[PDB]
């Protein structure tokens, strides 16, 4: 059974630009030394992404228009899943991804999710009739190191595509999206298509330092260069500057 925590107010969020991050693989085709022009939903370069920081319980409901770019600079795995739904009224189907101790469990159901879900899963109490369940054992995860987890959630023509990327990052000056290329790989292609309009995250409080950068996608044409080993090394936005559109 859920319980509304006490002493929790609201906090005005901030905004920060994305340093050429949020570029995934459009299709499952292998190419080398090819400059391909795609017209898929990508993240525009230098976009004002939020800067939800937790050190203290930032978990607001955010709109899901066409795509979500979810970054996480963590070291102790603070966040452990997400929740997607259009009304959150225990009436229609809603997607839930929760990280276990050794696996990831994804459900399509209408559990009794309350206003303030937080983490053994005390976020819901009952389980209605579900249409899809998936348990994936390989889940999704030295002192002077940190973990950067990139995720791209898209919902087009029914299939909810989930791209992921894991990388080690050095603890720099106050955290922000670092510079470089990531090339998120396709991870999940669930047989789904229920309507999704809003979403939220899932924290983990172990009662005896993290930040996410939720962004929004939009239709854009990108120019991707494939290397000889089959990975993308750079990307042109084609709608950023006169130089970017003349290249």
């Amino acid at each position: 059974q859920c319980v509304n925590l006490t002493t929790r107010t609201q906090l005005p969020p901030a905004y920060t630009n994305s340093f050429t991050r949020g570029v995934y693989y459009p299709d499952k085709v292998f190419r080398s030394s090819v400059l391909h022009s795609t017209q898929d939903l990508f993240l525009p370069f230098f976009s004002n992404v939020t800067w939800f920081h937790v050190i203290r319980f930032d978990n607001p409901v955010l709109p899901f228009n066409d795509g979500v770019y979810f970054a996480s600079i963590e070291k102790s795995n603070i966040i452990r899943g997400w929740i997607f739904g259009t009304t959150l009224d225990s009436k229609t189907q809603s997607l839930l991804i929760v990280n276990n101790a050794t696996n990831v469990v994804i459900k399509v159901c209408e559990f009794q999710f309350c206003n303030d879900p937080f983490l053994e899963f005390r976020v819901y109490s009952s389980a209605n009739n579900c249409t899809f369940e998936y348990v994936s054992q390989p889940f999704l995860m030295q002192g002077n190191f940190k973990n950067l987890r990139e995720f791209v959630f898209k919902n087009i023509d029914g299939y909810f595509k989930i791209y992921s990327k894991h990388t080690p990052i050095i603890v720099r000056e106050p955290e922000d999206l670092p510079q470089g290329f990531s090339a998120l790989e396709p991870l999940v292609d669930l047989p789904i298509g229920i309507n999704i309009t809003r979403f939220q995250t899932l924290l983990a409080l172990h009662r005896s330092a993290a930040a996410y950068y939720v962004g929004y996608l939009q239709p854009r044409t990108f120019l991707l260069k494939y290397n000889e080993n089959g990975t993308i090394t750079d990307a042109v936005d084609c709608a950023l500057d006169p130089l970017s559109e003349t290249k």
């Binding site: 499952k28 292998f30 090819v34 790989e185 089959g230 990975t231």
Partner: protein, 363 residues
């Protein structure tokens, strides 16, 4: 024919295009994983009784009838409606498997049309039955020398009822019009017959696990299909490849293109399929069409002779005297080491002529 004239002048003329035709029809479909649970009907617990014979809705799966083999020496493969083989090329919308154990002395009773005492009071099979009936002895794992009463059946019945329904009602029986009405004595016994399976008994009335597979087909789409082709992989030749969704013609070879775990296919500058991945056995190939080119006929003129030379543009004299040049493979001319004036231009510094018997030369 290509010049629309009966008098061809001296010169080289390209007539048509040469292209090698494929030989095989390799498919290479993936390893099915959604197999049907046929082990919970055969390799399940001992068995179900014949008065409450159960069957599950075996639908929406891929039932491979080859996993049923490699077991106890099951004989009497008597199936009706369809041949014992060729089941892997048909799909029924539903399959129902029955599990019940009766005496093996008159197992011929379990068949369309045949009636009697076992196949009448316990479980009758209609004359129209396209399923598959099989049987096998299981006395080595379903017997014990004390008296085996773990399987019961029926003896008292008035008439023959409808087919294909379970008979669990065991109300009191009447052999005539005697108003017994709950006495439980002579001529009014309890309607329930029992068994006795002992290894000392002969092969006649020993327990026999029998299973019938009724293949029910409706207007619903076919769900229970069988295995697919999954042909062998033969490379180093032009084959008709028939992969999951990438069909076509071309040669297959070993490729060094290191694919990614999620990538399955590969394109090129011309947006054409270049490399593929064999689903069942992870191995990257390279789709390349076989040798093709244009045929050009060098003719010294129909007025003077009728001999011709054939030049295939873009070959290597290894797929069609012959002469390998930088333009193809000339067949019909003799490469003379001398050098004359270029009469019929062929290419790459090589030309042809009709010089002295009379034969076409290349120089």
């Amino acid at each position: 024919c290509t010049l629309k004239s009966f008098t061809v002048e001296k010169g080289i003329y390209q007539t048509s295009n040469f292209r090698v035709q494929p030989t095989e029809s390799i498919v290479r479909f993936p390893n099915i994983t959604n197999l049907c649970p046929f082990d919970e009907v055969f390799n399940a617990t001992r068995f179900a009784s014949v008065y409450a014979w159960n069957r599950k809705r075996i639908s929406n799966c891929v039932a491979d009838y080859s996993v049923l083999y490699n077991l106890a020496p099951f004989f009497t493969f008597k199936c009706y409606g369809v041949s014992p083989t060729k089941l892997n090329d048909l799909c029924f919308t539903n399959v129902y498997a029955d599990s019940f154990v009766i005496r093996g002395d008159e197992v011929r009773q379990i068949a369309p049309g045949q009636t009697g005492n076992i196949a009448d009071y316990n479980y009758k099979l209609p004359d129209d039955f396209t399923g598959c009936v099989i049987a096998w002895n299981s006395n080595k794992l379903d017997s014990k020398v004390s008296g085996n009463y773990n399987y019961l059946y029926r003896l008292f019945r008035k008439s023959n009822l409808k087919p294909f329904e379970r008979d669990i009602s065991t109300e009191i029986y009447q052999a005539g019009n005697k108003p017994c009405n709950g006495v439980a004595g002579f001529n009014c016994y309890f309607p329930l017959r029992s068994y006795s399976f002992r290894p000392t008994y002969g092969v006649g009335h020993q327990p026999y696990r029998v299973v019938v597979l009724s293949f029910e087909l409706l207007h619903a789409p076919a769900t229970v299909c069988g295995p697919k082709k999954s042909t062998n992989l033969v490379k180093n030749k032009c084959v008709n490849f028939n992969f999951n969704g990438l069909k076509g013609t071309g040669v297959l070879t070993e490729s060094n293109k290191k694919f990614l775990p999620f990538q399955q296919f590969g394109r090129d500058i011309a947006d054409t399929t270049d490399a593929v991945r064999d689903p069942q056995t992870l191995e990257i190939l390279d789709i390349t069409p076989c040798s093709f080119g244009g045929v050009s006929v060098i003719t010294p003129g129909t007025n003077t002779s009728n001999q011709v030379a054939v030049l295939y543009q873009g070959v290597n004299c290894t797929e069609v005297n012959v002469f390998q040049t930088r333009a193809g493979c000339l067949i019909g001319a003799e490469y003379v080491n001398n050098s004359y004036e270029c009469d019929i231009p062929i290419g790459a510094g090589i030309c042809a002529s009709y010089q002295t018997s009379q034969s076409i030369i290349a120089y």
